[PDB]
């Protein structure tokens, strides 16, 4: 049927918690290599570049 419960809404605080955990594990290169990103020449893993 078309009226299946297709969509799921999550709590806003849970969505903010999960996105803060994702931003926190965007650091920690042991979690980045275990994801599978080749990292071997990256000078600093919180890679912040200019505003240019």
């Amino acid at each position: 049927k078309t009226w299946r419960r297709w969509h799921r809404r999550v709590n806003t605080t849970q969505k903010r918690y999960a996105i803060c955990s994702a931003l926190a594990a965007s650091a920690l290169p042991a979690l980045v290599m275990s994801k599978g990103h080749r990292i071997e020449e990256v000078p600093e893993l919180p890679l912040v570049v200019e505003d240019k």
Binding site: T2, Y17, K52
Partner: protein, 52 residues
């Protein structure tokens, strides 16, 4: 409050200049992959077209 290091800002050719920004506490937020997987697999169902 936890420890916050000082991340450098790289230029357009590598070659890190004298600009240094303190790391936010968002990167020191706790990691819970069960919450990340919960929120991911519940928000992933929202861009899903119906079939009948």
């Amino acid at each position: 409050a936890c420890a916050r290091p000082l991340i450098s800002v790289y230029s357009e050719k590598g070659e890190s200049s004298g600009k240094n920004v303190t790391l936010p506490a968002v990167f020191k937020a706790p990691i819970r992959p069960d919450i990340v997987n919960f929120v991911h697999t519940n928000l992933r169902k929202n861009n899903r077209q119906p079939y009948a």
